[PDB]
Symmetry: D3
Subunit: 213 residues, 6 copies
């Protein structure tokens, strides 16, 4: 009986689907026919679930190019630490799809990172988030131990950057990655997407900093 | 690398193109995200949730893994449950879509599960969370083969994830209150359409705003 | 003392009930062929064979504190395995989740954080019914005392039915129409059972 | 449904019958349970702990699973450890009985363990908590087969659970204190008798 | 760096001295290890099992962790069970010694367990495998404090580990078969002495080849 | 007499010999340990870390398991991570050495992993934590066999554990600060020498105080 305020969102989404069907799909039938025969992505793109991040949009990629993992905080647990989807998706990308490029892309104003900086406060209302963030506890420990001089937005920014670097260390513990890095076949990349400025900063191992590509 | 070079050129095209003509949207979004849909879909590079729904940046909070699987509550400690909880509890999302798709690699693997152990051991382990799909399909659709069998696995996998979602505390509590809807979508890549599960009918039909994927006889709720 | 009573009781059984039911026990010795999987609480006030006046051999029984079945893959104790054996090996096609009034596990659930010190294993176990706790705290925040416990008993049963639906053997058999699930509340003081009815969305006298 | 209909008719029969004849007992029990025994037994439908011990409602706090197994402390996160902890710590029980039984399906499975993984994967994983039974039986009773081997597996499984119980904090502490006792029982269905493990004789013998 | 320079100088002394005088021993050992004792002891730098027993290389197969703890069977997936299994099954070792020691940091932590969660979260979780020791000590020695309390915890921890070892399949089976014995030793660092648990006596006494740590009353075995 | 009789006689020789000449040291050590090195090595009886480095009691805090394996952070709940955390956080150690050795039984097992399931199931499961070694060796050294293959597995196993160590919070934070160093050593039993990994060179060389195992291209740090 009466007002149920969630319904407009679904109507809108279905209208948007019809617009895709009538618009982009209708002008790209050959592309979708070709793709239906198989995916051949060349990039594994790991990024946050945050609704403000669209990997295809910011890279102006066409459908078929990016095999994408999305979770809160763009975290890849150390090998063997977790039995969710992250390790399996990465493995499929590298072993079945033969991808040779992995990007860990974090972003400004990340909610997972804000949470990480107030971790104990999450237990009560966000218990699964609290447990999940333990897979990036190395970030938290490094940030709390070494960056106390920072506050506010500067501190969140450092947490976003350090979290990406933690995931690169975590990735190095997976068998498929360790083997292929020996082979010399595979490259890892760390990116920060700055939402307000529409830009990406990439980690440069010589400068030990995230800088414009 | 040519592929990385293409992405960097793409970044510039975005900044000079779409970003430049949507600066106010991005400054607004810089203050916070307010999505109204949790969209769970496959990592498959052929699937773009924002594209297929013509969503604007800010609209869809997205989980992507191989096979668009959500383990039952307490079964796993990866990203899935946590991202869903963040969406529902922190972001107050009230619509969840489990979106599968045609020709899904994870589903092909599920139908040849034992063969995955050697080269795809993590995928083998992960697909344990959709074992109910495999059991149901092998038991009840034993006469299907080839493309038809993969199509059934894609569809049934979505239905399994909907059962798995209903074991999470945030979901269970909100369904009692009647404040949340669950949807199951199959994106057909070549055909350019989506099919949606109508849980009253117990079948997939074209999307419409008054269906959802819950099966009434399994509500198990008081008043 | 109470061990002695049990030992005397063994004698009473052998000379009484066993003596007058020799055909039954000789029959049972060839195999178990239960009809029902009965999931209930460890509470000493609950006796499923007694309240249903079942014959020995009819009920394959799982008993734990709170009559909880964790979601599939969440736990590696006895519950899932016993259910699987019941359905796959023994071909049982009826499952009853039976809760009961005044359940200690439910009292604990409503004071969960306080259990961590002296009952750490109970604290961890009750996490498998956290969906109950969250639902009850969110949606019955104005209920108190006995009333709140009674609601937690009822809602706990329904949570377990949801959890059962995640198991492969259950999911597959429900598809085929070869399995039925039931939720029961046993009211100790009144000697009655109320059964969940999915059309009424309520627990009703059968 | 005829099976369910028969249960319902049994409920009414309990109400008008045993319940009506024991109103006082149930009113009293409505105020709390005060069992003095923790009874761990198999889910097997042929086993009824209250029946075989001629116990009254309220006497036995009961754990039932396939094979009457208690995993070692920390090994599992299902119901067993928690129910035992509730019994000992909250209900102050000071007697624990592990009761196995003849013809146990879990034990038949244990003796063909690898064959179970395909159709009974959860049972395969669960029986690993009694792998010490399997190893012991394979290494030390190689000259038994068939029903004799199953019977020895039933007996040995009980002893393994006693060892497993001894790893739980509440049990370890209270055994040291001296205010807790453990017991191992085998219920022979076909004979209507229980044999209890005797540490002096190192065998299961009739109680008296 | 200076620590490393000094350590590498010590390595050079080993090479020049003991190695050069024992080349044949090391050649022989290179063909296979044949130890006859599994020695479980603490990681504490004050404990050296070969030194205190004046053993030769090749004699002791050694497990070292903080607190000399062996989790119950199935409780953990670290190295302890696997190392023990290799010792018993592959190397046919018939003697296990659990050796604790005075002033053990793990035991000090155990007695203040809750205080460890913040800064030593992994130690906190690990010590749960000896929670039976903590519970026993808090329940049965409640009037002890300070060093007396730590001393009791050291001793009781050894007895807990013996219970935990008895849940492992190889141990359970070989105790019954007759090819295994268990021992529980306390090394008192300040005095250079060891006491051994005599399971018949239920007390710690001088070590003796005739005694072992199993209590006859708790055998739980069929004969 | 028996192995146990020898050990017990050895206790008395220790007390009346070495303990006497180091009586002041042991009195000092009874007040607290202050090691400066965390030494991780195999349980193998042929390895004695204090002997091979001619270390004094109090110098080396030691972890020993089969194969000298450190699981990745969060992957395991046995003793390894806890012991390392105690060493770094409670004892402020600033040097970690992962020491493997020639002819390692864990490495022989790793190369015949499937065969271990039946009689060494716990070892099979434990070796999962060094699967990255097995994958690398099978993929990249597929043409080696016999002793040559075991030798490469011993070396690559050390490198895997160094990657695993770098996932732990205490290590990651201290590496940022620059007050911790990681080393990878191979102890060659017959030959009486140690080889150390120089992470700049990406190869094993004779030990020296100004190398360590860290690979500069994988520093992944902000400065
Ligand atoms: Cl996306
Ligand atoms: Cl549903
Ligand atoms: Cl019962
Ligand atoms: Cl050592
Ligand atoms: Cl490195
Ligand atoms: Zn984010
Ligand atoms: Zn897919
Ligand atoms: Zn109850
Ligand atoms: Zn049974
Ligand atoms: Zn110690
Ligand atoms: Zn070794």
């Amino acid at each position: 009986s009466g007002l149920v305020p969630r319904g407009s969102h679904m109507q809108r989404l279905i209208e948007g689907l019809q617009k895709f069907r009538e618009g982009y799909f209708s002008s790209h039938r050959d592309l979708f026919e070709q793709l239906s025969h198989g995916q051949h992505p060349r990039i594994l793109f790991i990024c946050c679930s945050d609704s403000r991040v669209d990997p295809n949009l910011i890279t102006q990629s066409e459908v078929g190019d990016l095999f994408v993992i999305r979770n809160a905080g763009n975290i890849i647990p150390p090998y063997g630490a977790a039995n969710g989807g992250e390790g399996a998706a990465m493995e499929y990308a590298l072993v079945a799809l033969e991808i040779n490029q992995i990007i860990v892309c974090g972003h400004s104003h990340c909610g997972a990172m804000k949470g990480l900086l107030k971790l104990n406060s999450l237990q009560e209302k966000l218990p699964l988030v609290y447990d999940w963030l333990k897979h990036t506890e190395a970030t938290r420990r490094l940030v709390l131990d070494n960056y106390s001089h920072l506050e506010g937005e500067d501190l969140i920014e450092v947490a976003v950057a350090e979290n990406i670097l933690t995931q690169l260390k975590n990735l190095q513990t997976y068998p498929a990655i360790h083997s292929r890095l020996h082979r010399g076949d595979l490259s890892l990349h760390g990116w920060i997407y700055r939402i307000e400025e529409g830009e990406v900063l990439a980690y440069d191992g010589v400068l030990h900093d995230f800088v414009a590509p």
